[PDB]
C-alpha cells in the first residue's frame, strides 16, 4: 500500500482520489492519503472552494516513483512532485502516519469499481496522450482541448487522443464508400485495431481514460472521444466476440459510476440511442442496456 504526503493544505479544497472525495478546510492539518492500492493507476484531483471553475488533477502509479503534493502560492494550485531521495520520503511518510495526519484510501473489500473502470488503463499510454516527458505523472484539467478539437490552440497542453472521424479518407476506402460508411468494421479492425492501437486492450484503455477525464474533470473533448470510440465499435458489423463482451462490462461500470445529476451533460442521446437500439450491436450490450434503461430511461 502506497502513500501520497501533502506538504500542507493552505487553501480550502475538495480533494478527490479516484472515485472518493473529501473536503479540506483552509490550513487544516491534512498531510495526504495512505493505503493506496498498488497495481492500478490512480488520479488525485482538486476543486478549490472559492473557484469551482477548473477541476484539475494528476494521473499517477505509485510503482513508478514516490510522489507528493505541495501547494504553489504563485501558480495557485496543488502540484504533484517526485521526491528522488527515498529515505527523505519514507521518513516524511512515517512521521505523518505516526501523527495520524493522513486519510486512508477508503476501499471496501468487496468493491471492484476502480479496477473495473481502469482495467485497461496504463500509465505509459496516459503519458503519450498527455505529453510532459519530464514527469512520471500526468496533469489534466477541465479546459484542456484535444488534438481533434484543435484541428477544428497550445499544442503542449493538449490531449493527444487518437483522432476518429467517420467522414475521412482514413475511415473510407476508395470504392467502398457506402460499404465503409454504413459498416465501420474495416476502420475499426484494420485501421484502428491492427494499425494504430495494435490490440483491443490499448483501445479499451484509451476509451476508459477518456471517460474518466470526462467524469472527473468535465472535460468536453474527452467526452467526445469516449462516445466516438463506443460508436465506432457499435457501428461495426464485425467485432470479435471477446471485445463485445468486454465492452458491455466496461460501459456497465461507467454508467454505474456516473453521477446521476451529470447524465444530462455527460451522455450523448444520439450515440446511446443509436448504439443500444439501431446499431449492429444493439443486441450485444445486455448489461449496459439494462442499467441504462433502469437508471436513465429519460435519455432514451
Amino acid at each position: 500500500m502506497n502513500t501520497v504526503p501533502f506538504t500542507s493544505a493552505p487553501i480550502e479544497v475538495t480533494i478527490g482520489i479516484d472515485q472518493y472525495s473529501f473536503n479540506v478546510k483552509e490550513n487544516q492539518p491534512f498531510h495526504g492519503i495512505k493505503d493506496i492500492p498498488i497495481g492500478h493507476v490512480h488520479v488525485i484531483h482538486f476543486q478549490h472552494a472559492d473557484n469551482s471553475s477548473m477541476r484539475y488533477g494528476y494521473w499517477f502509479d505509485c510503482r513508478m516513483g514516490n510522489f507528493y503534493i505541495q501547494y504553489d502560492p504563485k501558480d495557485g494550485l496543488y502540484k504533484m512532485m517526485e521526491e528522488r531521495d527515498g529515505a527523505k520520503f519514507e521518513n516524511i511518510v512515517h512521521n505523518f502516519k505516526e501523527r495520524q495526519m493522513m486519510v486512508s484510501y477508503p476501499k471496501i473489500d468487496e468493491d471492484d469499481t476502480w479496477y473495473n473502470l481502469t482495467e485497461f488503463v496504463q500509465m505509459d499510454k496516459i503519458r503519450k496522450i498527455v505529453r510532459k516527458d519530464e514527469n512520471q505523472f500526468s496533469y489534466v484539467d477541465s479546459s484542456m482541448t484535444t488534438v481533434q478539437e484543435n484541428e477544428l490552440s497550445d499544442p503542449a497542453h493538449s490531449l493527444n487522443y487518437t483522432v476518429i472521424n467517420f467522414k475521412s479518407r482514413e475511415a473510407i476506402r476508395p470504392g467502398h464508400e457506402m460499404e465503409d460508411f454504413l459498416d465501420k468494421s474495416y476502420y475499426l479492425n484494420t485501421v484502428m485495431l491492427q494499425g494504430i492501437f495494435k490490440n483491443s486492450s490499448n483501445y479499451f484503455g484509451e476509451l476508459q481514460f477518456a471517460f474518466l477525464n470526462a467524469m472527473f474533470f468535465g472535460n468536453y473533448g474527452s467526452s467526445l472521444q469516449w462516445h466516438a470510440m463506443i460508436e465506432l465499435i457499435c457501428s461495426s458489423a464485425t467485432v470479435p466476440k471477446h471485445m463485445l463482451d468486454k465492452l458491455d462490462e466496461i460501459l456497465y461500470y461507467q454508467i454505474k459510476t456516473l453521477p446521476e445529476q451529470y447524465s444530462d451533460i455527460l451522455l450523448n442521446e444520439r450515440v446511446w440511442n443509436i448504439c443500444l437500439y439501431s446499431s449492429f450491436q444493439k443486441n450485444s450490450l445486455h448489461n449496459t442496456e439494462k442499467i441504462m434503461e433502469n437508471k436513465y430511461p429519460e435519455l432514451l
Partner: protein
C-alpha cells in the same frame, strides 16, 4: 450553409455550382402478384444535375440493370447518385468543376460528402427551397430518352433552350421553376397551356416551345393561375 430565400441571388453569380436532385433515380411501379402479394418493378430513372447559371443539364440515365440483385434500393439509390455525381466532377476539367453542389434532399448530404472526400474544397450544401425538379420527367423529351435507354447513358441538354440570348439567368431559373411547379401540381393542365396553340412549335434541339417574349408573359401568367387555383381546388379557397 443552407441555400434559402435570403441567399437566392448566389445561384447566378460566377462561382460554378450544380443542383443535384435524386428524386427520379429509383422509380418503381407497385403491383399485385398472382398470389395476391405486392411487388415492385423498377423502371429507368435519372439524376438531374443542373447548373442554374448556364442551364447546362447533365442527365445521367439510371438503367434498371443497376438494381439487379441489390437490397435496400432506396438507400442504395442515394449512394449511386453520389457515385455518379463524383464521377461527373472527376470527368470535368478543373476549370469546369463546381465550387459548390447543392442537394435538393438532405438525405443526399452524407453520401455525397463521403464520395467527394477527394474534393475538400467543393462545398456540399442543402437547401430550404422546395424546388420542383422531380417534375423533370414531365418534360416529354427528357422522359423519352430515359424510358428508351437500354444501358447507362449521360445525355447533355440546355434546360433553358436559347432563353439566355434574351433574359438573365435569374429570370430563366424563375421561368423554369414556374413551369416545373405547374407541371408538378397539375401535369395535364400545364401541358395543355404549353401546347394549346399548335403553331408555336418546339425546335428539334429544344425542350420548350418557341414563344415570343409577349407569349412567354401570357404563358407564365397562365401557369401562375393554375398553381394558385390548384392550391384552392386542394385547400378549397
Amino acid at each position: 450553409g443552407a441555400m434559402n430565400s435570403s441567399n437566392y441571388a448566389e445561384l447566378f453569380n460566377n462561382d460554378i455550382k450544380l443542383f443535384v436532385d435524386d428524386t427520379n433515380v429509383y422509380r418503381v411501379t407497385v403491383h399485385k402478384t398472382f398470389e395476391g402479394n405486392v411487388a415492385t418493378k423498377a423502371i429507368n430513372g435519372c439524376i438531374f444535375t443542373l447548373n442554374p447559371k448556364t442551364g447546362h443539364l447533365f442527365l445521367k440515365i439510371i438503367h434498371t440493370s443497376v438494381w439487379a440483385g441489390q437490397k435496400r434500393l432506396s438507400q442504395l439509390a442515394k449512394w449511386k447518385t453520389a457515385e455518379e455525381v463524383s464521377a461527373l466532377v472527376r470527368s470535368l476539367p478543373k476549370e469546369e468543376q463546381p465550387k459548390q453542389i447543392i442537394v435538393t434532399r438532405k438525405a443526399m448530404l452524407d453520401p455525397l460528402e463521403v464520395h467527394m472526400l477527394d474534393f475538400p474544397n467543393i462545398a456540399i450544401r442543402p437547401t430550404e427551397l422546395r424546388l420542383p425538379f422531380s417534375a423533370a420527367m414531365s418534360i416529354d423529351k427528357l422522359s423519352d430518352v430515359v424510358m428508351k435507354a437500354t444501358e447507362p447513358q449521360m445525355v447533355l441538354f440546355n434546360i433553358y433552350d436559347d432563353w439566355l440570348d434574351r433574359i438573365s439567368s435569374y429570370t430563366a431559373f424563375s421561368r423554369l421553376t414556374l413551369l416545373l411547379r405547374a407541371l408538378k401540381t397539375n401535369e395535364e393542365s400545364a401541358k395543355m397551356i404549353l401546347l394549346s396553340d399548335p403553331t408555336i412549335t418546339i425546335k428539334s434541339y429544344h425542350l420548350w416551345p418557341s414563344f415570343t417574349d409577349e407569349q412567354w408573359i401570357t404563358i407564365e401568367s397562365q401557369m401562375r393561375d393554375l398553381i394558385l387555383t390548384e392550391y384552392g381546388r386542394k385547400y378549397n379557397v
